[PDB]
Amino acid sequence: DTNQREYYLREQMKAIQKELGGEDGLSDLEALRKKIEEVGMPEAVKTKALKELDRLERMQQGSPEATVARTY
Amino acid sequence: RYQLEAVKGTSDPAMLADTIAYHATWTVAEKQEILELTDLEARLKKVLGLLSRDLERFELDKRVAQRVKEQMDTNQREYYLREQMKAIQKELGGEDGLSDLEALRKKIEEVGMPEAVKTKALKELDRLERMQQGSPEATVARTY
Amino acid sequence: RLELPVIPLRNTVILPHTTTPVDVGRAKSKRAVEEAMGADRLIFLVAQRDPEVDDPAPDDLYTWGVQAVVKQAMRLPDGTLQVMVEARARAQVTDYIPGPYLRARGEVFSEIFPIDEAVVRVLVEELKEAFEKYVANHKSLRLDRYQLEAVKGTSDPAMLADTIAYHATWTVAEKQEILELTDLEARLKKVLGLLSRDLERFELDKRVAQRVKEQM
Amino acid sequence: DTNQREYYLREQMKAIQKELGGEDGLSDLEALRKKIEEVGMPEAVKTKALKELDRLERMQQGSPEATVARTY
């Protein structure tokens, strides 16, 4: 019971990250994709940001590789 | 399959044997050695041995092909094994978690290491493909 | 021949003397069925790779196409025309005509084949054995037993070989390489090898099923 | 739902790993097994070697408790 309660606690903590989820829904993969053209950035940095966008298309609270890629 | 019953026109042994030996295609030297013979029994034995060896080679090639089919079945077994493992690696992250394994294996090849050192490199590289995220099971070996 | 219409296939494989459905998923390929209707339903279908350019491109065609006479002609002018074709024989793709929609030229029916047809019929019997072993084990493919009821009354080894080659589901590349080879006898060996490959795949699927259950 | 899905997927990975050609087995471990079985050795030494060989089968690759066994 204690183990299941702690598991539900951590999962509910993951759920209640609504503010992070809202950024992922609209700003992430959409506004950031256009942000490359809106601001001045080096060509190689822009293209690596394009791969970082390609590292997206999955939930940021799932595989931590995607989470840290979105942090990058 | 029409010359099989066309041997009706050949009744004496010489013409039938010559037609059978000629209409079956093989190397130039073997065919020319027959013409250099004037004794019937010796060349008949030679042609009989040629036919027996060709039949044996046909049977051996058929058996070899049948065993090669099982071998390639096992090869495609290992291939779909890799397919499932790579799909699972891909499901967590596209082209692996950080897309590193291909580059690491390319650097192993392109950096000239000793052959035994190469063996340890491939072993510690195959030690990957079963973890990519957590406590030291990939990160320790990736760093190594 | 004279630019017989080529329909861009939708993950479909056409083999000689075998019924195959062909559909469309674009407005560009909608005219191909009607041009076939005008051409008395005698067409030269050249296969294309898994889903191609969004527009019909005559660059995904392969070396060999196949002649086909339409058996079933459904009129569905709603974005999907279902034409069922029974192919006659393969042919060599001469060139390509840019579209949309695309055309391709072909030669006469491939009427030349190897002989020793008696051993080919023996291998057809063994192929029926192998396909019975296949479909009976492969009930997870959702392939009906009716496909095992059509290999009876076979008057020609090639039609049975092609029917078994298409009725077993695997990668489209292997199914297409089955068509591209003009050797009658090597096609049966390819079919047997791929059937055994799918058999061992099913075997290890079961194996890893109990293995993962044991892991749980 | 996602956690149970990924748990079953990880279990699939583990189950297929033991069947993935047994790459870790024999090549990186049983080589030492043969060398024990091919040296003219006292009986008690072989008994101790087998005792310390059965102590393995736990991953020293993440555990320092059996690197000492491998070096032994």
- In chain D, which residues have their Cβ closer than 8 Å to the Cβ of A11? 3
Listed by number, the residues of chain D in 19-38 with a beta carbon closer than 8 Å to a beta carbon of chain C are 19
Specify which residues C96 forms β-bridges with. C104
Contact between C208 and D14 using a beta-carbon 8 Å cutoff: no
Comparing alpha-carbon positions, the chain A residue that sits nearest to D5 is: A62
Q: What does the DSSP 8-state code read for residue C83?
A: E
Burial status of residue B131 (CB atoms within 10 A of its CB: 0-12, 13-18, 19 or more): buried
Q: Closest approach of chain C CAs to the CA of D72, in angstroms? A: 31
Binding-site residues on chain B for chain D (CB distance < 8 A): 78, 81, 84-85, 88, 91-92, 123, 126-127, 129-130, 135-137, 140-141
Q: Which two tokens stand for residue B106?
A: 């390319």
Q: Which chains touch A (3 or more CB pairs under 8 A)?
A: B, D
CB–CB of C65/C94 below 8 Å?
Answer: no
Q: What is the amino acid identity at position C152?
A: K
Taking the alpha carbons at both ends of chain A, their separation in whole angstroms is 38
Query: What angle in degrees, to the nearest 10, is found between the helix axes of B101-110 and B115-126?
Result: 170
CB–CB of B102/B109 below 8 Å?
Answer: no
Q: What is the SS3 assignment for B88?
A: helix
Residues 6+ apart with CB under 8 A from C17: C86, C87, C88, C156, C158, C159, C162, C163
Sign of the alpha-carbon dihedral angle for C200, C201, C202, C204: positive
Contact between B73 and C192 using a beta-carbon 8 Å cutoff: no
* Residue C114 touches partner B, C-beta closer than 8 Å: no
- In chain A, which residues have their Cβ closer than 8 Å to the Cβ of D6? 62
Which structural domain range is residue C67 located in? 4-104
Contact between B1 and C197 using a beta-carbon 8 Å cutoff: no
B119/C144 Cα distance (integer angstroms): 50
Q: Which two tokens stand for residue B77?
A: 């077994």
Burial status of residue B47 (CB atoms within 10 A of its CB: 0-12, 13-18, 19 or more): middle
- Closest CB to B1: pick one of C115, C189, C196: C115
How does DSSP assign D33-69, residue by residue? HHHHTTS---HHHHHHHHHHHHT--S-TTS-TTTHHH
* Residue C200 touches partner B, C-beta closer than 8 Å: yes
Q: Which two tokens stand for residue B55?
A: 């039949």
- In chain C, which residues have their Cβ closer than 8 Å to the Cβ of D12? 208, 212
Contact between C208 and D12 using a beta-carbon 8 Å cutoff: yes
CATH code at position C86: 2.30.130.40
Contact between C204 and B77 using a beta-carbon 8 Å cutoff: yes
